[PDB]
Design an enzyme around this catalytic site. Sequence first.
Site, mmCIF file in Angstrom:
data_model
loop_
_atom_site.group_PDB
_atom_site.id
_atom_site.type_symbol
_atom_site.label_atom_id
_atom_site.label_comp_id
_atom_site.label_asym_id
_atom_site.label_seq_id
_atom_site.Cartn_x
_atom_site.Cartn_y
_atom_site.Cartn_z
ATOM 1 N N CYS C 399 0.795 -0.887 -0.117
ATOM 2 C CA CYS C 399 0.052 -0.035 0.031
ATOM 3 C C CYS C 399 0.678 1.215 0.052
ATOM 4 C CB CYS C 399 -0.955 -0.005 1.281
ATOM 5 S SG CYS C 399 -2.581 0.728 0.806
ATOM 6 N N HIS C 526 -3.406 -5.452 0.250
ATOM 7 C CA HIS C 526 -2.866 -6.148 1.355
ATOM 8 C C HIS C 526 -2.947 -7.750 1.150
ATOM 9 C CE1 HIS C 526 -2.747 -2.603 4.377
ATOM 10 N NE2 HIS C 526 -3.425 -2.171 3.329
ATOM 11 N N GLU C 528 -1.761 -9.932 3.042
ATOM 12 C CA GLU C 528 -1.715 -10.491 4.248
ATOM 13 C C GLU C 528 -2.746 -11.120 4.989
ATOM 14 O OE1 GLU C 528 -1.924 -6.404 6.566
ATOM 15 O OE2 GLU C 528 0.001 -6.980 5.981
#
Lengths: 556, 556, 556
Positions: C399, C526, C528
């Site tokens: 990001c 993202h 993750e």
Amino acid sequence: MKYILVTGGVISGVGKGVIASSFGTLLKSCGLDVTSIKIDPYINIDAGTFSPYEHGEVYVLDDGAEVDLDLGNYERFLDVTLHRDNNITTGKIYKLVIEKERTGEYLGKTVQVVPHITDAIQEWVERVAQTPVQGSSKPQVCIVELGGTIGDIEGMPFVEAFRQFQFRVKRENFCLAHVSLVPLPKATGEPKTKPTQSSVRELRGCGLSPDLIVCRSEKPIGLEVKEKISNFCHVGPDQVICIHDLNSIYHVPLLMEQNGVIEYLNERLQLNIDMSKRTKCLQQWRDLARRTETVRREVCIAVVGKYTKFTDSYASVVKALQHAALAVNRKLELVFIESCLLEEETLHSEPSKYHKEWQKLCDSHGILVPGGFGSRGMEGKIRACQWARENQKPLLGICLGLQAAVIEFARNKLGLKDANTTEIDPNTANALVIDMPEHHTGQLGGTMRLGKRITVFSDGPSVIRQLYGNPKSVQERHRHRYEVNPKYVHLLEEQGMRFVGTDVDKTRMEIIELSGHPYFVATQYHPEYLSRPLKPSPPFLGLILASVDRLNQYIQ
Amino acid sequence: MKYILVTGGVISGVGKGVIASSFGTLLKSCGLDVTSIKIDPYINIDAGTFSPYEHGEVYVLDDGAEVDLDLGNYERFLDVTLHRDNNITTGKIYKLVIEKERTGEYLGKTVQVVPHITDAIQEWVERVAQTPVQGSSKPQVCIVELGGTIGDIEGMPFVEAFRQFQFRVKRENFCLAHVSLVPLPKATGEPKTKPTQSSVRELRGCGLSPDLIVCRSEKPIGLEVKEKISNFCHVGPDQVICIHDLNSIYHVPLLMEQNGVIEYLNERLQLNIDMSKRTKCLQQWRDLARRTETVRREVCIAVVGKYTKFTDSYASVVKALQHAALAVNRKLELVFIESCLLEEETLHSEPSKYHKEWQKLCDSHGILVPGGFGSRGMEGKIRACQWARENQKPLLGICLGLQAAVIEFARNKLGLKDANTTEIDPNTANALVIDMPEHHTGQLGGTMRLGKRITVFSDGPSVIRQLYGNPKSVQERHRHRYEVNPKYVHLLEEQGMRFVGTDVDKTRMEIIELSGHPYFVATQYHPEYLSRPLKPSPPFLGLILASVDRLNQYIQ
Amino acid sequence: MKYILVTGGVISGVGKGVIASSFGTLLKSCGLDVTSIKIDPYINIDAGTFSPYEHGEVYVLDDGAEVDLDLGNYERFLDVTLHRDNNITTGKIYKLVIEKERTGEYLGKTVQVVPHITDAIQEWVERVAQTPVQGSSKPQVCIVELGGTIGDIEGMPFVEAFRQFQFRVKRENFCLAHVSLVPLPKATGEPKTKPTQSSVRELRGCGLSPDLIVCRSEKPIGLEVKEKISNFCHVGPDQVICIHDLNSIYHVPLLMEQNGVIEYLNERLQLNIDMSKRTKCLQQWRDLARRTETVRREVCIAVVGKYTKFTDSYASVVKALQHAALAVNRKLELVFIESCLLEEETLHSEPSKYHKEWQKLCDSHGILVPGGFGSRGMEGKIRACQWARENQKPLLGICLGLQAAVIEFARNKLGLKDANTTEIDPNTANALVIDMPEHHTGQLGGTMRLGKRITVFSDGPSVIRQLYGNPKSVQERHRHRYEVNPKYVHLLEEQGMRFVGTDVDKTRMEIIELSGHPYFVATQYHPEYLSRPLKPSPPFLGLILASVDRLNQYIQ
Ligand SMILES: Nc1nc2c(ncn2[C@H]2C[C@H](O)[C@@H](COP(=O)(O)OP(=O)(O)OP(=O)(O)O)O2)c(=O)[nH]1
Ligand SMILES: Nc1nc2c(ncn2[C@H]2C[C@H](O)[C@@H](COP(=O)(O)OP(=O)(O)OP(=O)(O)O)O2)c(=O)[nH]1
Ligand SMILES: Nc1nc2c(ncn2[C@H]2C[C@H](O)[C@@H](COP(=O)(O)OP(=O)(O)OP(=O)(O)O)O2)c(=O)[nH]1
Ligand SMILES: Nc1ncnc2c1ncn2[C@H]1C[C@H](O)[C@@H](COP(=O)(O)OP(=O)(O)O)O1
Ligand SMILES: Nc1ncnc2c1ncn2[C@H]1C[C@H](O)[C@@H](COP(=O)(O)OP(=O)(O)O)O1
Ligand SMILES: Nc1ncnc2c1ncn2[C@H]1C[C@H](O)[C@@H](COP(=O)(O)OP(=O)(O)O)O1
Ligand SMILES: [Mg+2]
Ligand SMILES: [Mg+2]
Ligand SMILES: [Mg+2]
Ligand SMILES: [Mg+2]
Ligand SMILES: [Mg+2]
Ligand SMILES: [Mg+2]
Ligand SMILES: [Mg+2]
Ligand SMILES: [Mg+2]
Ligand SMILES: [Mg+2]
Ligand SMILES: [Mg+2]
Ligand SMILES: [Mg+2]
Ligand SMILES: [Mg+2]
């Protein structure tokens, strides 16, 4: 009269006693006269029937009363001679009120808690606060410590009584310091203010409000935590005092002074303490703290005690040893040795622990055998005494240590292999230690030889008599219930031992000494209760000097 | 063993005693054996030192113990002979625990409230519940009443003890009935459920939960109020019982039965009560309630008592009078007359009240002079006794009434104008009533002539001897501390009086009577403590019969 | 339906989330379908407006909702796809009830807390518990976690709602696990049970009772402490579960199993779980725990993040890195580096810290630049990106890392020294990163590009396309509000960079890559949030492989 109330937060080991003692030290540095009252919400009349694990070592006062170690801390930090009435328990108040009701003082009305128990508590506090404690001194400030934590069912009468008390004596005479814990969990990694918020909420629900918030932690907390506590407790930023774990308790008064506690108390309680004169007030304590920081030489003393699992069960013993070690510019390395692990039975169960404890005992410059109750660990005390007497290691025995020394002497030198105490072996062929007839009336609690007595030094050159200052007789506090048999003492004295301490009647002997061995001294009384930071107990000082090989130099 | 706990709502006059007595009556109607324990959170050892205004008349048990009137209600509704251990007070428990700790039972650990006081309370309840109370009967249900209201500081140990007790004996053996008040303010005009909700919330915060909610009001509440209580208390609609103000307390068991209390308790407590056999169980109580509703003939008795301002200060006396009145199919008009207003001092202060009370006393068919303590109102008792003796009005004096009658007789007939009691006038030329030497040891509370004794009837025809059944000696309960002078009794008996009741030693006289006057009987003991709904006290029955002019007919 | 409630003790970082996730893991190992509901007593509608310091990293769900990291833990340990309705906040309930009242659903009656707010809470819990979460699976157990601690003013509606809920669904369907902290102060030296007793007392006062007591400490507590907790909490000895600080959270399910949690829950909740089949159920977790214990090879990744002071602000980032490191049999050495200390301003203020952080960054095998908000620490991110691009150190930006990489590329390679983001420098001559027009309506909170989207891989050989599995397009979750300028991207692509990730419109680019440098990958989304213990995120796996010099081997 001004009153300071110290209440508990989330735990009872938070440090209320040290905080109250430091308050007393700071207020006495200014010049005021400070009283101390310990409130124990338990129902026991006294502490003479407590295990050392429950709250710590049991203190013996001058009049025979057995009290908490908090009174010992008060006497050590304030150098005052407290009385039986400086400890308030629930049992005392309830017994007083019940006796008054039975006599007829409360005729006509029912006796309740709020109008009667709380009134009795307030009357007790007001009457004891004015009782002289350092001589003819009229006290000015009374510091009341509430045992336990806020929210207990046992403390409800006392918190209600103090809620009425703050208005009875007006807010200018009453202050309340709250001591709380700020945990820092390893997994979470950040200080937590929630328990302190809950404690403050409970205290406000009880009708009180903390003038001070003492936050106790292991490491200093950040300013964010302190600001959070100030915001969520409705307390000023400068009214929150952070006390972390310090090297010694001597730093606590200095820490609170550098946190400006004295100024806040002077403005809040209108103590009229002048700032100009009170300079270099804590010079004794600053010097003591510096000496504790700057002691390099090593002295090792091994304590063969049965209450090792809790480090505060020998509080007075450790404090007397520390005073003696500091009085000779030595760093006290204290190794606690469980006497159970020194017995041959442990060898057949845990040989590793047995050998570890024996080698811990063998590498020490001195040995100390304190008192105790029961039969567990007593054989280990006998073994330690035997080794010390054999290898010329200096040793100091207290109460039970004297009985263990006599037992070892009779068993080895006199050959009486069946020698034992009536406390452990009532059916003994050679009862070396027997019972005092007048202290077994079947009522445990305040029934032994308690309080100050008189000890007579025997006619003959003894180094223990020198250590005290070569007097004719000395006064000490006793906490024993059994005494040695006179007939065997006649035999033991002839063989190798010298009973150099007895009473006026020359029937109750108290101090033993041996020819040969450099320092083997045992006492029936407790010399530790009279030790002060600037007045180390002569027995402990002699033990330290003999351990560091300086006793002969100190003699001349 | 099954236990029922009756707790208090917003007030302590709500009616817990009547509810517990009705529970006992219902359970004994089924066939079970019911015990009763009264818990008084006050610290007084007994009730022997209470004012009648604080909680009501003080009951005297068979063994001499002075207890609350709740034990009197238990004995009246259950016909059981309670003991000293059926009353639990805070002072009793605390004294017990303190003595145990001092002896050495709790050696090693500190005595606290939650582990020790509550344990002592539970042990007391369990031990007393099993004590036989009606002979050889083994009890099955114990009804414990908690004095006061939920939320008091005094009741916290007991509520904590019962919170542990409900799990100690499992929930199937333990039930909890909560009695609350539902006020109906005149200005607001609607029943209010908020106090009951607050009481229930407090009880749930204490760790308990009401199995029953007994709503007490003055008039029956609507179904909306009951539904609101059920919703906001988390209680079932049929689990809330509404008891309003009834004509007599005999309707309360019937009301609770018609509300299905017995069925709910049988299912909840697993009492295994069979429904088929238990028909017409409360026939005695239904008959008594109908008789109370259907008594037309009027009998008026004036009570010249000094505790008139509180109507429950003469509970046992009023109940005995009611029993006697019902035993002869008469409606008892009870007019309470303050003896203070019958003194000539009131004439010089409030002539209107003096004349009103004198005309209230003059229009009654009989007079009763109960006992009391102090000197206030005693002259009014003398004046009432004098008027009754002069105008041939039947009179019954109890304890202090006997001393008043003796004083009046000596002052008027014998002319000793200085006659008085040592209780009021210690410096008396003619001490007509003196003190018993062995009951003034300076310890008020359980030190009088207390409990059952033996009264010997004198050799001679006396109508009071007939009234009891013409026995040789009778047993009654005594609550007196002063007794009349033997020497003046020799003179008084000669003149116009007949001392027809004494003890075995013939030294302590108890009952007086005089020739002439139809019914003038005074007793040193209290006959009201032995009165039961089907066993009216013979003195009260004789007084009623003489008042209604039927004593002569009853004699033959 | 069966419900498990996990409540808090004395602190909110005690570990309720891990306990609830472990409960879900154990129950799903048996074969049941487990739901998870997180209750946040705060008033924020979602967590999109939280600082990472307040509670940790903010999770993004599949539908765009921003929730707590507890939902991330639920998805990681349960492999379920939660929804917006699995998070309950006070604001949600109050907004729902207010809208319903305004529409007219509650016509006639006033809307209160106990009858209406609690009813809405119960309806929400019952409706969400039945919502499918793993596909067509019908859930069997719902695990509700109450955020905060018992006693907060915010949690009172929820504790009251669950107090009614336990009786609404009967006790056989409802269980309550209480997680408490057992501090062990260094000065006191012994574990303290008082805070747990206070928490249990508060929970019982609230009307609930803990079926389980999970005691959290740093080291295992002795049996004396556990017995004390069992005695003073009125809980069985085997109903107290001790969880200490473990090496990894994978040991918590195994620890609770070896403490017999599954058997107790099966008997208490009547889950009908058969013991015979459920053998070797936690084989994946046991294998993972053994691998965490038995990883020797070292891999070092430096995180240049601005939220370093709190270690849980990058929870998902750290978890994805750990998953990737375990997937290649490597031990992850994580060094957190504050990006502020890497700026030249720190050099002029704290040169020692600047050099320490730069040498920490220089000794790492790889660098990661996660996202963030604000302008603080962004220049440090630029400096770290510049150094990594210059010295061929592998780097992964997320990001804000992509924007920092674009800024560095434009400033250095293109020479535009004034390049900056509109987020930090709105008045920019060369606005390299600009704002998306439709996400700045002046309403912060749920107004960005949120939730799953579609990312299109550009036509051209790129190793990041391989790493995912050589697809044409992939779906990921977005939490960005600014996007790079298209015109400069045309220039940057020509010079040295390859924008290999865009959207369907080919206007919003997401992934950048550079020729030359081995591994320099930056993502706008993202990756993750989609990482699971057995499904490491391909970007993190590629970063780890490039750091340990194994990416080329893995390619072929
Ligand atoms: N055993 C004992 N204790 C006494 C006596 N008089 C007062 N006390 C006190 C001291 C003790 O600390 C406490 C008893 O509690 P403990 O059981 O813990 O004593 P003790 O040191 O023997 O521990 P132990 O039972 O051997 O493990 O009562 C006594 O005559 N005998
Ligand atoms: N006065 C008095 N009361 C006693 C005695 N022995 C037990 N008691 C009890 C009975 C009384 O109800 C209570 C005393 O409270 P009170 O002051 O209200 O008694 P008394 O009836 O005299 O009311 P009074 O003071 O005259 O207004 O103590 C006694 O010897 N004398
Ligand atoms: N600064 C900012 N925060 C946003 C925005 N949209 C949602 N949020 C959230 C993320 C942040 O964690 C939170 C703002 O709280 P902070 O002040 O702690 O954010 P920040 O990371 O910038 O910390 P800082 O002020 O630089 O120390 O609001 C936005 O547009 N700008
Ligand atoms: N600020 C501090 N730093 C280090 N140790 C401390 C301390 N305050 C207290 N201690 C030690 C002394 C005591 O042995 C123990 C706490 O017990 P205490 O001070 O007697 O308080 P309490 O009476 O509340 O138990 O910890
Ligand atoms: N249901 C009812 N109807 C009428 N009178 C009642 C009643 N319940 C109780 N009473 C009367 C009897 C008592 O004198 C008084 C209440 O006191 P009590 O019954 O002894 O209860 P407590 O012990 O709570 O004071 O009111
Ligand atoms: N038994 C345990 N051993 C080690 N670490 C633990 C643990 N339980 C929890 N943790 C870690 C994980 C979390 O980051 C933190 C506690 O927070 P949490 O588990 O999310 O609970 P809460 O939701 O109450 O904050 O500590
Ligand atoms: Mg302590
Ligand atoms: Mg203390
Ligand atoms: Mg303790
Ligand atoms: Mg013992
Ligand atoms: Mg009453
Ligand atoms: Mg009653
Ligand atoms: Mg009253
Ligand atoms: Mg009086
Ligand atoms: Mg959390
Ligand atoms: Mg959580
Ligand atoms: Mg917080
Ligand atoms: Mg900001």
